[PDB]
A paper describes a structure:
Type I RM enzymes house these activities in a multisubunit complex having ATP-dependent translocation activity that pulls thousands of duplex DNA base pairs through the stationary enzyme, eventually cleaving at random sites distant from the recognition site. Upon identification of an unmethylated specific DNA sequence, two HsdR motor subunits, which bear the endonuclease and ATP-dependent DNA translocation activities in the fully assembled DNA-HsdS-HsdM2-HsdR2 complex, start to translocate the duplex DNA toward the stationary enzyme from both directions, producing two extruded DNA loops flanking the enzyme complex. The X-ray crystal structure of the HsdR subunit with bound ATP from the Type I restriction enzyme of [name] plasmid R124 revealed four structural and functional domains forming a planar array: one nuclease domain of PD-(E/D)xK type that houses three endonuclease active-site residues and a QxxxY motif common to the RecB-like nucleases; two RecA-like helicase domains of SF2 type that use ATP to translocate duplex DNA without unwinding; and a C-terminal α-helix-rich domain presumed to contact the HsdS-HsdM2 methylase. ATP bound between the two helicase domains was found unexpectedly to also contact Lys220 of the endonuclease domain, suggesting a means by which nuclease and translocation activities might communicate.
The three mutant HsdR subunits were crystallized with bound ATP, and their X-ray crystal structures were refined at 2.74 Å, 2.84 Å, and 2.99 Å for the Lys220Arg, Lys220Ala, and Lys220Glu mutants, respectively, guided by the higher-resolution structure of the WT HsdR-ATP complex (2.6 Å; 22). The closer of the two equivalent ω-NH2 nitrogens lies 3.1 Å from ribose 3'-OH and 2.6 Å from ribose 2'-OH, enabling one or more potential hydrogen bonds with the ribose. Thus, Arg substitutes structurally for the Lys220 interaction with the ATP base edge, and can make a novel interaction with the ribose as well. In the WT and Lys220Arg structures, where residue 220 contacts ATP, Asn221 points away from ATP. In the WT HsdR structure the backbone and sidechains of residues 182–190 are unresolved; in the Lys220Glu mutant residues 181–191 are unresolved; and in the Lys220Arg mutant residues 181–188 are unresolved. The crystal structures reported here show that mutant Lys220Arg HsdR maintains contact to ATP similarly as does Lys220 of WT HsdR, whereas mutants Lys220Ala and Lys220Glu lose contact with ATP.
Numbering used by the authors: 13 to 140, 149 to 180, 189 to 583, 592 to 859, 873 to 886
Amino acid sequence: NFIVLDKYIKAEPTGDSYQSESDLERELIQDLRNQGYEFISVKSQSAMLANVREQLQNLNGVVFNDSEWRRFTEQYLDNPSDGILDKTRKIHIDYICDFIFDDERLENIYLIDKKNLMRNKVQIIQQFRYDVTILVNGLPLVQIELKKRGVAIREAFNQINSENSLFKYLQLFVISNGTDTRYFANTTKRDRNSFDFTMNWAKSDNTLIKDLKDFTATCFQKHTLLNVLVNYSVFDSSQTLLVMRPYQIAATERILWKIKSSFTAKNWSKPESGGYIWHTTGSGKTLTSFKAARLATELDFIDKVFFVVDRKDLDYQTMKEYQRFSPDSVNGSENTAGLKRNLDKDDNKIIVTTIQKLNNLMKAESDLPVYNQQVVFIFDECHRSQFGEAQKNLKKKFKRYYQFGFTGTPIFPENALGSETTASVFGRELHSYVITDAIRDEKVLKFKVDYNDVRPQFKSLETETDEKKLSAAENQQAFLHPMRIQEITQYILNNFRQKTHRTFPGSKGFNAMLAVSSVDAAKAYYATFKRLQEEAANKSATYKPLRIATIFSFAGEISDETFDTSAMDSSAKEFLDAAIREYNSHFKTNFSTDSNGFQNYYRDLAQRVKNQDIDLLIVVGMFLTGFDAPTLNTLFVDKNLRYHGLMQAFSRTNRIYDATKTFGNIVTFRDLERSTIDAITLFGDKNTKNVVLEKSYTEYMEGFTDAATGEAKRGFMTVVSELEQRFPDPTSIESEKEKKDFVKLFGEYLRAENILQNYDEFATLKALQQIDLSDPVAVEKFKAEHYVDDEKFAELQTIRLPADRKIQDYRSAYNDIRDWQRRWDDVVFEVDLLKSQ
Ligand SMILES: Nc1ncnc2c1ncn2[C@@H]1O[C@H](COP(=O)(O)OP(=O)(O)OP(=O)(O)O)[C@@H](O)[C@H]1O
Ligand SMILES: [Mg+2]
């Protein structure tokens, strides 16, 4: 009985007017009542408290007196000092209070029955703003915000903890205009707080369920809702609440059903017992897989659950997270001691480990009791090389097992390259969520891939398709040639802030990575960066330097780098040591070259790249696979990437953040265009690249038509033209209609400008807006910096952009109309783009 349905029957309108908010609320209440949600009238905190007393007393089979209830309220349920985070902690972890009565007996008082869900009492109330609140055992856990049919859901979200304090217990938010319904977690954290994280409910085929009637009839089925709240909502060690998306739940629950059905049939340790999940890169594989293992421990018939990852994919939050379930057993090292120690932990089913360690252990160990136990394996995006050996030993040793795997880049026959196919190893595909689905849902970002062809001397070298010549090409004469490195480094320095959206004043923006071909490349780059930055530091006292850092150790798959720095040669070792010394100096930290020091350097670095304490990370093969950095928008690539490695590296930029991050920038100094198309194609079909790859500069300036949606889009020059024709201003106002039309138009302007900030052509056009009128030192400087010859420099002067001041006036008027709107249904303001500018 899956809560993400294989088949659902699109319901019928009554009807029975569906236009207004109270109409939506009427049908919502009626439908929920048909679904077994008792409706009650609660006008106060007092009445809520009373109702809760009733439900909890019934649920726990106990009766408080007024003194005991008051004490229970003040010290556990209703603590005045409690915030939202404390209530979430109470729902997810601390949901049992061991209470001392007046007669001095001790009893466990549950807020929720998680063992038997349906014993829980669900109820509904309405607003005491049109809202409908779902109470579980009296506690409000769900909030449905209702808006009129006309109201744009993104603006509705844009609009909408203290008192009444019981509403701190809120876990799940849902907001509907009746055409569309979107759910999102309740939290105080602000980094997941944008519209991009709101979610549509769906089926196993990931077909969306937009409207309120069907959302209600599916997501709001008591069994579905309660399972989403209790079993499908992850609370991490940073006290962040993440509600899972339908594809994550579908995959997870299908894995659970698979394990159980395979156990009932006593059919195990063969491909048909387990399964694989194809979840496109960035879709949340680590979150879901770890969650699945944790749920798999809840099966009584299972003795042990292995959750296994690749040390290559480790980073700060993830290690912090694994530490509590498997103390000091998860790291870069080869040591199996922590693994075999956790393996002996009494009354404990979960073991997190790295594939390296599991393989080492399975190599060294023979008679381990676990081999004979009923075991579940969950593999999270493991590289092929280690995985094969691990599989050989796994097959030979564990006698009763169900193994599962998550990947965003499966192994088909056509990419086999010496290894076994994913299907051969894991058997059936239990669920799929592909790249095109993810991009359709906006849960993942597109790529803008561009070869920067600025360098004629090195061009034929950068276009080389032959594998052997490329290997031979790494030296000071060809790829590592001082001028090439200097030109690239100068480009990256010059265009960094532009790429990363640091350009407009006071803007926070993003950061970037530089992926390179080898250790010598990394060294050359770091050195050149320091040199050029010191020179620019001389040239100007107003220069504001970037913070560069690097990490690497020793070696279309991306080559793994061990955490043992001893394997490095002396030159690299000394350069890394020097780099860590400098890093230590600036950041006031102590990390050393030794195993532990380098391990903690890796950790601290991951952390500082995630929060933008470091502006550009110069890496070779590290952090190119699993690294999670939503604020990283740009990857610079001097390296040969193909297929799964290509997709995995590029995906470092694919994390959604908000309206500011439109897509990830991939700026390459070697021609990757063909490899990009091949890679995207392998993992999709011949049309996949059109959905994945962003369109051209010319298309965004002059207009085009999107294939997937079918909609026509302006047309930034068209937008600007309409701004000047229709709104010379202030007289182009004052009526309401003109205000509205202007808000819509300028909205388009802001979205288009924001998009075009990532194109060198537009950056150049904008750049040209200071320049000349007498001394052409800055003219030739403009030509050299933007690599623009005279033939272009002539035409760029012909293209009229609107004056900076006119833009400022537009922006301030836009903001004014917004503030006024606070004190119009179709209209959506760009809050996110505004708040930066
Ligand atoms: N259901 C969700 N709700 C909120 N945030 C989510 C959800 N699922 C994933 N995320 C966020 O998306 C980001 C990427 O998650 P994650 O690294 O698990 O994806 P992945 O597919 O494992 O990535 P990769 O393919 O690089 O290994 C994380 O920061 C995570 O917090
Ligand atoms: Mg991951």
